[PDB]
Protein backbone atom coordinates (compact mmCIF):
# COMPACT_ATOMS: atom_id res chain seq x y z
CA UNK A 1 0.00 0.00 0.00
CA UNK A 2 1.00 3.63 -0.48
CA UNK A 3 -0.30 4.68 2.96
CA UNK A 4 0.88 3.38 6.34
CA UNK A 5 -0.92 3.74 9.67
CA UNK A 6 0.72 4.36 13.03
CA UNK A 7 2.36 1.29 14.51
CA UNK A 8 5.35 -1.04 14.41
CA UNK A 9 5.83 -3.54 11.58
CA UNK A 10 8.23 -6.42 10.95
CA UNK A 11 9.79 -5.99 7.50
CA UNK A 12 12.87 -8.18 7.04
CA UNK A 13 15.87 -9.82 8.72
CA UNK A 14 19.60 -9.16 8.89
CA UNK A 15 22.67 -11.36 9.29
CA UNK A 16 26.34 -10.50 9.76
CA UNK A 17 28.32 -11.30 6.62
CA UNK A 18 31.48 -13.45 6.66
CA UNK A 19 34.91 -11.83 6.48
CA UNK A 20 37.28 -14.36 4.88
CA UNK A 21 37.87 -18.10 4.43
CA UNK A 22 39.99 -20.64 6.31
CA UNK A 23 41.41 -23.88 4.88
CA UNK A 24 43.06 -26.47 7.15
CA UNK A 25 43.78 -29.51 4.99
CA UNK A 26 46.48 -31.92 6.25
CA UNK A 27 50.08 -31.42 5.17
CA UNK A 28 50.92 -34.89 3.83
CA UNK A 29 52.62 -34.71 0.42
CA UNK A 30 52.44 -38.30 -0.81
CA UNK A 31 50.90 -39.13 -4.19
CA UNK A 32 48.25 -41.83 -4.37
CA UNK A 33 49.29 -44.79 -6.58
CA UNK A 34 46.67 -44.21 -9.27
CA UNK A 35 49.38 -44.54 -11.92
CA UNK A 36 50.23 -48.04 -10.68
CA UNK A 37 46.61 -49.20 -10.93
CA UNK A 38 46.51 -48.20 -14.61
CA UNK A 39 48.95 -49.22 -17.38
CA UNK A 40 50.03 -52.22 -15.31
CA UNK A 41 50.37 -54.34 -18.51
CA UNK A 42 48.59 -57.19 -16.67
CA UNK A 43 44.90 -57.26 -15.75
CA UNK A 44 43.34 -60.23 -13.99
CA UNK A 45 40.32 -62.15 -15.24
CA UNK A 46 36.81 -61.00 -14.40
CA UNK A 47 36.06 -64.06 -12.26
CA UNK A 48 39.07 -63.18 -10.05
CA UNK A 49 39.31 -59.39 -9.92
CA UNK A 50 42.10 -57.47 -8.22
CA UNK A 51 41.17 -55.24 -5.28
CA UNK A 52 43.53 -52.45 -4.20
CA UNK A 53 43.08 -50.19 -1.17
CA UNK A 54 44.15 -46.53 -1.28
CA UNK A 55 44.51 -44.39 1.84
CA UNK A 56 46.89 -41.93 3.51
CA UNK A 57 47.89 -40.00 0.39
CA UNK A 58 47.00 -36.91 -1.62
CA UNK A 59 44.73 -38.01 -4.47
CA UNK A 60 45.04 -36.32 -7.87
CA UNK A 61 42.93 -37.17 -10.92
CA UNK A 62 44.70 -35.15 -13.62
CA UNK A 63 46.64 -38.23 -14.79
CA UNK A 64 43.37 -40.02 -15.56
CA UNK A 65 42.28 -37.43 -18.13
CA UNK A 66 45.57 -37.65 -20.05
CA UNK A 67 45.73 -41.45 -19.70
CA UNK A 68 43.55 -42.34 -22.69
CA UNK A 69 40.27 -41.38 -24.39
CA UNK A 70 37.55 -43.27 -22.55
CA UNK A 71 34.75 -45.45 -23.84
CA UNK A 72 32.97 -44.76 -20.54
CA UNK A 73 33.62 -42.44 -17.59
CA UNK A 74 30.46 -42.65 -15.47
CA UNK A 75 30.27 -41.41 -11.87
CA UNK A 76 27.08 -42.18 -9.95
CA UNK A 77 27.12 -40.53 -6.52
CA UNK A 78 29.56 -37.71 -7.32
CA UNK A 79 29.88 -35.18 -10.14
CA UNK A 80 32.99 -36.13 -12.16
CA UNK A 81 34.16 -32.50 -12.40
CA UNK A 82 34.34 -31.97 -8.61
CA UNK A 83 36.50 -34.93 -7.52
CA UNK A 84 39.46 -32.57 -7.03
CA UNK A 85 37.88 -30.93 -3.96
CA UNK A 86 36.17 -33.67 -1.92
CA UNK A 87 37.72 -35.74 0.87
CA UNK A 88 37.09 -39.47 1.28
CA UNK A 89 37.81 -41.98 4.03
CA UNK A 90 39.11 -44.92 1.99
CA UNK A 91 39.35 -45.67 -1.73
CA UNK A 92 38.81 -49.07 -3.38
CA UNK A 93 40.05 -49.82 -6.91
CA UNK A 94 39.04 -52.92 -8.89
CA UNK A 95 40.51 -53.56 -12.34
CA UNK A 96 39.88 -56.30 -14.90
CA UNK A 97 39.24 -57.05 -18.59
CA UNK A 98 35.83 -57.75 -20.14
CA UNK A 99 34.16 -57.97 -23.53
CA UNK A 100 33.13 -54.76 -25.27
CA UNK A 101 29.38 -55.39 -25.44
CA UNK A 102 29.15 -56.34 -21.74
CA UNK A 103 30.27 -52.94 -20.42
CA UNK A 104 26.64 -51.94 -19.78
CA UNK A 105 26.31 -54.87 -17.36
CA UNK A 106 28.61 -53.07 -14.91
CA UNK A 107 26.07 -50.81 -13.18
CA UNK A 108 23.97 -50.91 -9.98
CA UNK A 109 20.77 -52.93 -10.26
CA UNK A 110 21.73 -54.82 -13.42
CA UNK A 111 21.40 -58.39 -14.66
CA UNK A 112 23.57 -60.67 -16.76
CA UNK A 113 26.05 -63.51 -16.54
CA UNK A 114 28.89 -61.20 -15.48
CA UNK A 115 26.49 -59.31 -13.21
CA UNK A 116 25.25 -62.34 -11.26
CA UNK A 117 28.14 -64.84 -11.47
CA UNK A 118 31.29 -62.69 -11.83
CA UNK A 119 30.97 -59.22 -10.27
CA UNK A 120 27.95 -57.71 -8.49
CA UNK A 121 27.61 -54.05 -7.42
CA UNK A 122 25.51 -52.80 -4.49
CA UNK A 123 22.39 -50.73 -5.06
CA UNK A 124 23.73 -47.79 -3.02
CA UNK A 125 27.05 -47.67 -4.90
CA UNK A 126 28.88 -44.33 -4.66
CA UNK A 127 31.84 -44.14 -7.02
CA UNK A 128 32.99 -44.15 -10.63
CA UNK A 129 33.35 -46.63 -13.49
CA UNK A 130 36.00 -46.22 -16.20
CA UNK A 131 36.17 -48.40 -19.31
CA UNK A 132 38.63 -48.04 -22.18
CA UNK A 133 39.59 -50.16 -25.17
CA UNK A 134 42.71 -52.33 -24.99
CA UNK A 135 42.51 -54.19 -28.30
CA UNK A 136 46.10 -53.23 -29.17
CA UNK A 137 47.50 -54.85 -26.00
CA UNK A 138 45.48 -57.97 -25.11
CA UNK A 139 44.57 -59.47 -28.50
CA UNK A 140 46.92 -62.13 -29.84
CA UNK A 141 46.77 -62.64 -33.63
CA UNK A 142 46.24 -66.36 -33.01
CA UNK A 143 44.07 -65.80 -29.93
CA UNK A 144 44.54 -65.01 -26.24
CA UNK A 145 43.01 -67.56 -23.86
CA UNK A 146 44.40 -66.26 -20.55
CA UNK A 147 41.15 -64.38 -19.78
CA UNK A 148 38.33 -66.57 -18.46
CA UNK A 149 34.85 -65.90 -17.07
CA UNK A 150 32.51 -68.02 -14.97
CA UNK A 151 29.37 -69.18 -16.79
CA UNK A 152 27.49 -71.69 -14.60
CA UNK A 153 26.81 -71.19 -10.89
CA UNK A 154 24.22 -72.53 -8.46
CA UNK A 155 23.13 -69.13 -7.10
CA UNK A 156 23.68 -65.42 -7.63
CA UNK A 157 26.55 -63.36 -6.21
CA UNK A 158 26.22 -60.94 -3.32
CA UNK A 159 27.55 -57.39 -3.85
CA UNK A 160 31.36 -57.26 -3.74
CA UNK A 161 31.83 -61.04 -3.69
CA UNK A 162 34.57 -63.07 -5.39
CA UNK A 163 34.54 -66.78 -6.23
CA UNK A 164 37.59 -68.74 -7.42
CA UNK A 165 36.24 -72.30 -7.16
CA UNK A 166 37.00 -74.51 -10.18
CA UNK A 167 34.82 -77.63 -10.12
CA UNK A 168 32.75 -79.42 -12.74
CA UNK A 169 29.23 -78.00 -12.53
CA UNK A 170 26.40 -80.54 -12.28
CA UNK A 171 23.24 -79.45 -14.12
CA UNK A 172 21.45 -82.78 -13.61
CA UNK A 173 20.48 -85.32 -10.96
CA UNK A 174 23.40 -87.69 -11.51
CA UNK A 175 26.75 -86.54 -10.07
CA UNK A 176 29.67 -85.53 -12.26
CA UNK A 177 32.00 -87.60 -9.99
CA UNK A 178 34.93 -85.53 -11.26
CA UNK A 179 34.63 -86.07 -15.03
CA UNK A 180 33.39 -83.84 -17.85
CA UNK A 181 30.75 -86.24 -19.10
CA UNK A 182 27.29 -85.53 -20.50
CA UNK A 183 25.18 -82.95 -18.64
CA UNK A 184 28.47 -81.97 -16.91
CA UNK A 185 30.23 -78.80 -18.08
CA UNK A 186 33.25 -76.81 -17.00
CA UNK A 187 32.47 -73.68 -14.94
CA UNK A 188 34.89 -71.32 -16.72
CA UNK A 189 34.92 -70.24 -20.37
CA UNK A 190 38.01 -68.77 -22.02
CA UNK A 191 37.70 -65.57 -24.04
CA UNK A 192 38.94 -65.46 -27.61
CA UNK A 193 40.69 -62.20 -28.51
CA UNK A 194 42.01 -61.46 -32.01
CA UNK A 195 42.70 -58.12 -33.73
CA UNK A 196 40.38 -59.16 -36.58
CA UNK A 197 37.33 -59.17 -34.30
CA UNK A 198 34.88 -56.31 -34.71
CA UNK A 199 33.95 -53.76 -32.07
CA UNK A 200 31.81 -55.37 -29.38
CA UNK A 201 34.08 -58.38 -28.87
CA UNK A 202 37.52 -56.77 -28.51
CA UNK A 203 38.84 -56.71 -24.92
CA UNK A 204 38.23 -53.64 -22.76
CA UNK A 205 39.98 -52.69 -19.53
CA UNK A 206 37.64 -51.62 -16.72
CA UNK A 207 38.51 -49.84 -13.45
CA UNK A 208 35.92 -49.28 -10.72
CA UNK A 209 36.58 -46.75 -7.95
CA UNK A 210 34.55 -46.87 -4.73
CA UNK A 211 34.57 -44.15 -2.08
CA UNK A 212 33.53 -43.97 1.59
CA UNK A 213 31.96 -40.59 2.40
CA UNK A 214 30.88 -39.24 5.80
CA UNK A 215 32.91 -41.59 7.98
CA UNK A 216 35.83 -41.49 10.45
CA UNK A 217 38.42 -38.66 10.00
CA UNK A 218 39.18 -38.78 6.29
CA UNK A 219 42.67 -39.21 4.86
CA UNK A 220 42.38 -39.25 1.05
CA UNK A 221 42.27 -35.63 -0.15
CA UNK A 222 44.38 -32.51 -0.46
CA UNK A 223 45.03 -31.18 -3.99
CA UNK A 224 44.33 -27.74 -2.48
CA UNK A 225 46.48 -25.64 -0.13
CA UNK A 226 45.79 -24.79 3.51
CA UNK A 227 45.67 -21.30 5.00
CA UNK A 228 46.24 -19.56 8.34
CA UNK A 229 43.91 -19.47 11.37
CA UNK A 230 41.84 -16.51 12.56
CA UNK A 231 39.59 -16.12 15.60
CA UNK A 232 36.84 -13.88 16.99
CA UNK A 233 35.50 -13.01 13.52
CA UNK A 234 32.69 -14.10 11.20
CA UNK A 235 34.77 -16.33 8.93
CA UNK A 236 34.32 -19.35 6.67
CA UNK A 237 36.20 -22.53 7.60
CA UNK A 238 36.96 -25.89 5.97
CA UNK A 239 38.46 -28.37 8.45
CA UNK A 240 39.29 -31.60 6.58
CA UNK A 241 36.07 -31.30 4.58
CA UNK A 242 33.90 -29.99 7.43
CA UNK A 243 32.76 -26.70 5.89
CA UNK A 244 30.92 -23.90 7.63
CA UNK A 245 30.86 -20.30 8.78
CA UNK A 246 30.91 -18.65 12.18
CA UNK A 247 33.20 -17.41 14.95
CA UNK A 248 36.05 -19.55 16.27
CA UNK A 249 37.09 -19.08 19.90
CA UNK A 250 39.31 -20.83 22.42
CA UNK A 251 37.70 -23.88 24.01
CA UNK A 252 37.91 -25.11 27.61
CA UNK A 253 36.60 -28.55 26.58
CA UNK A 254 38.39 -31.70 27.78
CA UNK A 255 38.65 -33.67 24.55
CA UNK A 256 39.76 -37.28 24.84
CA UNK A 257 42.76 -38.09 22.62
CA UNK A 258 40.53 -39.94 20.12
CA UNK A 259 37.57 -37.59 19.61
CA UNK A 260 37.53 -35.12 16.73
CA UNK A 261 34.21 -33.23 16.77
CA UNK A 262 31.70 -32.02 19.33
CA UNK A 263 27.92 -31.99 19.58
CA UNK A 264 25.16 -30.64 21.81
CA UNK A 265 21.58 -31.48 22.81
CA UNK A 266 20.32 -30.18 19.45
CA UNK A 267 22.96 -32.42 17.77
CA UNK A 268 24.93 -29.72 15.96
CA UNK A 269 28.66 -29.08 15.74
CA UNK A 270 30.05 -26.75 18.41
CA UNK A 271 33.74 -27.72 18.71
CA UNK A 272 36.56 -28.96 16.48
CA UNK A 273 40.29 -29.67 16.66
CA UNK A 274 42.81 -28.26 14.21
CA UNK A 275 44.60 -31.07 12.30
CA UNK A 276 47.91 -29.20 12.05
CA UNK A 277 47.98 -27.99 15.68
CA UNK A 278 46.17 -30.09 18.29
CA UNK A 279 43.87 -27.47 19.82
CA UNK A 280 40.16 -27.43 20.65
CA UNK A 281 38.17 -24.51 19.23
CA UNK A 282 34.54 -23.59 19.87
CA UNK A 283 32.31 -22.55 16.96
CA UNK A 284 29.53 -20.01 17.41
CA UNK A 285 26.97 -18.84 14.82
CA UNK A 286 27.30 -15.30 13.53
CA UNK A 287 24.82 -12.66 14.66
CA UNK A 288 21.39 -12.56 13.03
CA UNK A 289 18.01 -11.10 13.85
CA UNK A 290 14.89 -9.32 12.72
CA UNK A 291 14.26 -5.66 11.86
CA UNK A 292 11.16 -3.69 12.86
CA UNK A 293 10.13 -0.25 11.61
CA UNK A 294 8.34 2.17 13.95
CA UNK A 295 6.48 5.05 12.34
CA UNK A 296 3.42 7.24 12.92
CA UNK A 297 0.82 7.61 10.20
CA UNK A 298 1.96 8.82 6.80
CA UNK A 299 -0.46 11.73 7.22
Amino acid sequence: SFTVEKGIYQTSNFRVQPTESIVRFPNITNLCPFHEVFNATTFASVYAWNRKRISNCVADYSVIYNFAPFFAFKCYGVSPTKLNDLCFTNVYADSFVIRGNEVSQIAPGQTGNIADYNYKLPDDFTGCVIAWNSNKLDSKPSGNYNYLYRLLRKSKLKPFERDISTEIYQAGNKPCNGVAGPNCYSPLQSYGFRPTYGVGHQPYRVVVLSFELLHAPATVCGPKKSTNLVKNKCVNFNFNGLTGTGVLTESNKKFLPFQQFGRDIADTTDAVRDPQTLEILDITPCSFGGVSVITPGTN
Partner: protein
Protein backbone atom coordinates in the same frame (compact mmCIF):
# COMPACT_ATOMS: atom_id res chain seq x y z
CA UNK B 1 7.17 -27.89 29.62
CA UNK B 2 4.92 -27.82 26.54
CA UNK B 3 6.72 -24.84 25.00
CA UNK B 4 10.16 -26.36 25.57
CA UNK B 5 9.06 -29.74 24.19
CA UNK B 6 7.58 -28.15 21.06
CA UNK B 7 10.70 -26.08 20.39
CA UNK B 8 12.98 -29.07 20.98
CA UNK B 9 10.96 -31.24 18.58
CA UNK B 10 11.00 -28.51 15.92
CA UNK B 11 14.78 -28.15 16.25
CA UNK B 12 15.36 -31.93 16.26
CA UNK B 13 13.34 -32.35 13.06
CA UNK B 14 16.13 -30.60 11.11
CA UNK B 15 18.31 -33.75 11.13
CA UNK B 16 15.97 -35.99 9.12
CA UNK B 17 16.77 -36.89 5.52
CA UNK B 18 13.22 -37.48 4.18
CA UNK B 19 14.67 -39.72 1.47
CA UNK B 20 17.81 -37.89 0.33
CA UNK B 21 21.52 -38.66 0.32
CA UNK B 22 22.15 -36.30 3.24
CA UNK B 23 20.39 -33.86 5.57
CA UNK B 24 22.90 -31.02 5.02
CA UNK B 25 22.54 -28.65 2.07
CA UNK B 26 26.13 -27.38 2.25
CA UNK B 27 27.71 -30.72 1.37
CA UNK B 28 25.20 -31.46 -1.42
CA UNK B 29 25.97 -28.06 -2.96
CA UNK B 30 29.73 -28.74 -2.84
CA UNK B 31 29.52 -32.43 -3.81
CA UNK B 32 26.97 -32.57 -6.66
CA UNK B 33 26.15 -30.45 -9.71
CA UNK B 34 23.25 -28.00 -10.21
CA UNK B 35 21.18 -30.09 -12.66
CA UNK B 36 20.74 -32.91 -10.08
CA UNK B 37 20.66 -31.21 -6.65
CA UNK B 38 17.01 -30.12 -6.96
CA UNK B 39 15.75 -33.70 -6.67
CA UNK B 40 17.40 -34.00 -3.25
CA UNK B 41 16.46 -30.46 -2.17
CA UNK B 42 12.73 -30.87 -2.88
CA UNK B 43 12.19 -33.64 -0.31
CA UNK B 44 13.92 -31.66 2.44
CA UNK B 45 11.83 -28.61 1.54
CA UNK B 46 8.59 -30.59 1.74
CA UNK B 47 9.46 -32.20 5.07
CA UNK B 48 10.51 -28.95 6.73
CA UNK B 49 7.38 -27.18 5.45
Amino acid sequence: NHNAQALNTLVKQLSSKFGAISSVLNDILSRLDPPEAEVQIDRLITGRL
